[PDB]
Amino acid sequence: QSERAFQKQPHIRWYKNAGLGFKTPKTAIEGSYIDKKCPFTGLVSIRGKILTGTVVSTKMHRTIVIRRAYLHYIPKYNRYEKRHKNVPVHVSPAFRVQVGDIVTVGQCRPISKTVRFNVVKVS
Amino acid sequence: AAPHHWLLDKLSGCYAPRPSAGPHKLRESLPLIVFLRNRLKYALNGREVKAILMQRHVKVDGKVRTDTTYPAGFMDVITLDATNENFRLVYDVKGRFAVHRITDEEASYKLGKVKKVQLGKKGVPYVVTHDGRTIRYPDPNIKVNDTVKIDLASGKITDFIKFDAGKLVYVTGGRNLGRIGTIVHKERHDGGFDLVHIKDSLDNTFVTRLNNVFVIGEQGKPYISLPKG
Amino acid sequence: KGRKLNYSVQDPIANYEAPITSGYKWSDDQIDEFFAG
Amino acid sequence: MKLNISYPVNGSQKTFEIDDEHRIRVFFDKRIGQEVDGEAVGDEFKGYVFKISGGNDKQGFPMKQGVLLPTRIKLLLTRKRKSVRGAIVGPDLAVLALVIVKKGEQELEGLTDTTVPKRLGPKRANNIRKRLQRKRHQRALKVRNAQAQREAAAEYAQLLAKRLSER
Amino acid sequence: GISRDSRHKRSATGAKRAQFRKKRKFELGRQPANTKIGAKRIHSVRTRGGNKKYRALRIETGNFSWASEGISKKTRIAGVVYHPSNNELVRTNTLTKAAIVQIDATPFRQWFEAHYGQTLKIESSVESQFSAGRLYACISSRPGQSGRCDGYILEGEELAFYLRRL
Amino acid sequence: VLKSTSANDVSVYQVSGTNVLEYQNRVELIQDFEFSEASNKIKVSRDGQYCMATGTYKPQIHVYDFANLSLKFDRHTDAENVDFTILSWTKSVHLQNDRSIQFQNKGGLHYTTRIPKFGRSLVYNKVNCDLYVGASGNELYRLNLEKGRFLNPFKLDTEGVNHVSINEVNGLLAAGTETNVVEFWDPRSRSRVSKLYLENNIDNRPFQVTTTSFRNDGLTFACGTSNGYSYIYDLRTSEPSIIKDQGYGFDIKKIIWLDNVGTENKIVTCDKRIAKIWDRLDGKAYASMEPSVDINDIEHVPGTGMFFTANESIPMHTYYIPSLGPSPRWCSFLDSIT
RNA sequence: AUACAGUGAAACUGCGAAGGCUCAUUAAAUCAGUUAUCGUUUAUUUGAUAGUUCCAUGGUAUAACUGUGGUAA
RNA sequence: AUGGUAGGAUAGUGGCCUACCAUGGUUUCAACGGGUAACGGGGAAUAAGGGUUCGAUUCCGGAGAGGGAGCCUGAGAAACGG
């Protein structure tokens, strides 16, 4: 689990808890995974709001592309055209998310150009 | 160019008084010029309200603070020496600043919502409020959104009101701004529309936020006196 | 290899300088009989 | 040329309009600081030595000490492009400033034989030569500030100790 | 440097017709000061009020930390052999954060002989540098921002973690 | 009268040294000659003025007018530089430590282009106008200033090249590689002509050649190393050479001739701390120019006996030799002060 | 009022001006609200907040000012 | 372009920039692109005791101090005053 230089390690194995109703799996408390930006050990802290939806693609690593269809009460043509949204998300050592898989994410500390959300739950 | 909270008549002028910086924010306060001059009318213009500020009649929160645009926000007890004027100003039911008149044993204190508790430096517990009174050493069971009671002679917390299900809460913020009745429901969500819900005359229901609500007492016994109609 | 080696033609350097006809003061026959070996 | 001359210790200074430029030609191609003799600028002031100290040329432009290039050049001074003549003196100076550091053979009824005094004596104590109640009050307010603050801090830390014992 | 804004570049949707704006003061990219070895010269630049920033260019006196006891002691700099955030950076021999640079470990010899008595439990491939003098150590501090050269020594696991690389 | 360092029966002088009554007898030649604590590279233009000195932190261009003895401007360029040339007057081309290339004009910053790999050296061709840029690897590139194209890059050996130079009277492209081979290409044919190998007698470690030079006869070639060892070369028995170990010997960076002033067959060598000067056909040191700080590189002004270094201190040193030649027309009272 | 003592041209100082016209046409990217920054800067406002001591007071160097001048300026 | 690892620069988050690596990402549930009564519109806001899209205002977009370029000052600037 070390394919890059420069002392791949936690930055002070290490373990913390964001709290607020989201579990930390036992390999993510005491396991060999580094958890650089997975918020359970991580360097990031949790805040903001939590969004939920199924996925479209998980092709690249550390990219979870959620879909999010939601109801909105349209008054214009008085029928509901169905919503769709997208958000990239970093991995977690709890679930290899495949197609389907309604999961939720919490807002924190922009990681790439467009990701502020990291997976905290699978159900 | 005015907000809604000041109860400001439109036939007044063109430039509206921006409050200066201070304890509260700009959006949740009224300065002393809009307090004294054109609300309870102890002045007629800015010159003579500056004159009585130089005379130093005002004693808001037990200190003088001679300034025209001093942002008196929620329940800062305005104290005026002549005719022993003690004024606690709270929110009415339609968004304005209802300035209730109180007495000396009630103006000897105020209360404040706690915002955060910190292990800041050198092992010192720590508490802030909406006027920012960084007072030393409360108990460990100060959560967020509880209510301290400030001493107003020194600064110490004298009494403490715990935030839980079944407490008398005041809502300052959003579309519920200035309501009282605090019990139909409790619902703590995980990031928004999370609150304790407030009754009406027919005990209707309401939604707000945690930070937009703060406790003032118990179900029938607040030690704040409140105005009536 | 995106920005790496764009084989394009660029606008301000297309006439940034101008060549010279004779150039080397030697001859090309002097080059050949200079480094035959 | 005009020669400004200054005898500094007596406090005297005067200009002298010296024509007849082969008298002047002793100073030529000698930059600022290098000394000179009285012998090749004059005969009536022999045994004289002058340290040159700059001079405005015609068109009024000054020279600053020690650069090069006795024509005019455009430098950056106290930063903007100001014109400044070179430090070396040539044929085209209007005035040239001189400090006489040794009187030679003739008295001068402008420089030597006439002098001015100084301005005024010193004002500072150490300059004349060459509070304690505030020292009471400073020390008293300092020890009172210590006996207030460093005792009150532990006096509410003990209230934290009471809250921790009761909790 | 130039910038810090998304306006000059494309987002996750592929947009065009940028032509946006004259760039503001708060998009301030300063020049990349590649810190080297020399005589200690730190430029004291200003930002955000009296926020002085120490931009080190020629720093030497690295405070490098003995790992197993945590003893940050003073030494010199030799050169970085491997740093593929730029593989030309080690060709030009600069000194940035997270670089693995070589140190004459003579004060670490002095501390070992001073708080242990004898000279040489510690690993063998760093005992070879205990004998010879030049040990590998990785910079922690930021000379381009904080102006300092601090670091941590290589002791065993992290040593082989870099020696298998290069 | 400026003081002179001891040497082999010869005198040199420094102006703007680390040490250079003194305040009131100042001998300052060029006003505002000081940088931000170091110096990158200095060179003097082909005409009689306008020397250019590259910057150190917030790197600049610093053109000094010799007929005004001060600074003209300082274009704070975008990145830190390593190598540049001057193309007459106002145009000039630069390349930075990143793989980018700037074209300065009278208005400044006419273009910024790039090369695909990290570059180390640049030279310009007076004939048909293609700048050759040496970089890391198999790659020696061209940017022709005629039609702005790119050209079919010259295929090198493994590691790369430290310095490229073309010969002046006939055009023989040098490229000082890492594996001691000098890789002479032909600027006519765009092909190799020779792969000359460099030898010694000490052989400490596998040195890399870092400096290449020619002169205006077109028959000899001055070679360097990464060890402090000058070399001469001719076509006449091109396998051996004459060599010059230097007494400290880290990396020689500047070896330049004296092929346009008097006191002939003389050459300047320059490694990191010292710069010396010796004679051809014997290999004996004429003089040396020991400063109080290290040297980033040097340059020699044409027609006269003066040198301009770029160093690691705040000012730059200028070195005057009143036996190699005189001081030039804009410094024509240096022979009157010292 | 024989070391200062009121008027006060011209000089240092504290601050003043604390927000004004024309020209080429951007579709929630210009804008408005909102979430957050234990992801960050902050003059001023407000509340808080300092424990290392071997054998009666420290130095020249510049003004303003005088004096000699240059230049059409 | 899309992300990962590290460094640089930052007031800091950030492919914001560079080395290396992977070939991604948005879209028929409307990507991306087409124009004006975009001198008009969007609550941007005051509303008036009968004017029903006239009728109160913030903002059209960003620039500019002869022309591009570089630098400096400050709690705040790429200054209407360098």
Tab-separated table of C-alpha atoms (C1' of nucleotides) in Angstrom, chain H residues 1-81:
chain	number	residue	atom	x	y	z
H	1	A	C1'	-9.377	17.996	-20.245
H	2	U	C1'	-10.830	14.412	-15.428
H	3	G	C1'	-8.732	12.674	-10.864
H	4	G	C1'	-4.508	10.839	-7.654
H	5	U	C1'	0.799	11.796	-4.939
H	6	A	C1'	4.326	15.547	-3.641
H	7	G	C1'	6.392	20.291	-3.911
H	8	G	C1'	5.931	25.750	-5.273
H	9	A	C1'	2.921	30.165	-4.482
H	10	U	C1'	-0.887	31.560	-1.234
H	11	A	C1'	-4.306	35.113	3.397
H	12	G	C1'	-5.168	30.166	3.311
H	13	U	C1'	-8.771	25.370	0.575
H	14	G	C1'	-7.884	24.239	-4.407
H	15	G	C1'	-4.347	21.096	-11.272
H	16	C	C1'	-4.009	27.734	-8.919
H	17	C	C1'	1.226	26.186	-11.375
H	18	U	C1'	5.001	22.246	-12.322
H	19	A	C1'	7.196	16.622	-12.077
H	20	C	C1'	5.198	11.653	-12.263
H	21	C	C1'	0.933	8.478	-12.946
H	22	A	C1'	-4.282	6.789	-14.444
H	23	U	C1'	-8.110	8.063	-19.428
H	24	G	C1'	-11.187	10.345	-17.454
H	25	G	C1'	-15.625	14.138	-16.887
H	26	U	C1'	-20.736	16.697	-18.729
H	27	U	C1'	-25.000	15.275	-21.809
H	28	U	C1'	-32.063	13.842	-24.697
H	29	C	C1'	-33.893	13.848	-16.613
H	30	A	C1'	-31.526	19.139	-22.033
H	31	A	C1'	-24.191	19.244	-22.228
H	32	C	C1'	-22.193	22.755	-25.123
H	33	G	C1'	-23.442	26.438	-28.370
H	34	G	C1'	-27.333	30.902	-31.251
H	35	G	C1'	-29.544	37.135	-30.121
H	36	U	C1'	-32.086	41.126	-29.114
H	37	A	C1'	-37.744	46.085	-27.605
H	38	A	C1'	-29.451	42.109	-22.225
H	39	C	C1'	-30.502	52.615	-23.645
H	40	G	C1'	-33.630	46.666	-21.511
H	41	G	C1'	-34.099	42.922	-17.951
H	42	G	C1'	-34.010	40.345	-13.602
H	43	G	C1'	-38.100	41.532	-6.955
H	44	A	C1'	-33.118	45.450	-7.333
H	45	A	C1'	-36.629	48.184	-4.147
H	46	U	C1'	-40.132	52.077	-2.446
H	47	A	C1'	-44.718	51.778	-2.852
H	48	A	C1'	-48.741	55.528	-3.887
H	49	G	C1'	-56.982	55.143	-0.951
H	50	G	C1'	-58.550	53.284	-8.616
H	51	G	C1'	-52.648	54.873	-13.148
H	52	U	C1'	-53.548	47.925	-13.644
H	53	U	C1'	-46.961	45.866	-17.377
H	54	C	C1'	-46.228	54.946	-17.442
H	55	G	C1'	-45.905	55.050	-11.855
H	56	A	C1'	-39.332	54.457	-6.674
H	57	U	C1'	-34.281	52.991	-7.269
H	58	U	C1'	-29.042	49.433	-6.811
H	59	C	C1'	-26.648	46.969	-11.278
H	60	C	C1'	-26.375	46.985	-18.081
H	61	G	C1'	-20.644	43.706	-18.969
H	62	G	C1'	-15.674	44.891	-17.691
H	63	A	C1'	-12.256	48.417	-18.411
H	64	G	C1'	-9.478	53.590	-18.802
H	65	A	C1'	-6.754	57.938	-16.497
H	66	G	C1'	-2.306	59.012	-24.003
H	67	G	C1'	-0.564	53.300	-25.414
H	68	G	C1'	0.441	48.226	-23.939
H	69	A	C1'	4.723	46.371	-19.969
H	70	G	C1'	7.359	46.161	-15.053
H	71	C	C1'	7.657	47.881	-9.935
H	72	C	C1'	6.063	50.472	-5.066
H	73	U	C1'	2.711	52.031	-0.897
H	74	G	C1'	-1.194	50.406	2.548
H	75	A	C1'	-6.279	47.071	7.689
H	76	G	C1'	-8.014	47.474	2.277
H	77	A	C1'	-5.319	48.713	-4.295
H	78	A	C1'	-2.459	45.327	-9.354
H	79	A	C1'	-4.346	53.554	-6.673
H	80	C	C1'	-8.376	58.822	-10.489
H	81	G	C1'	-3.567	61.319	-6.162
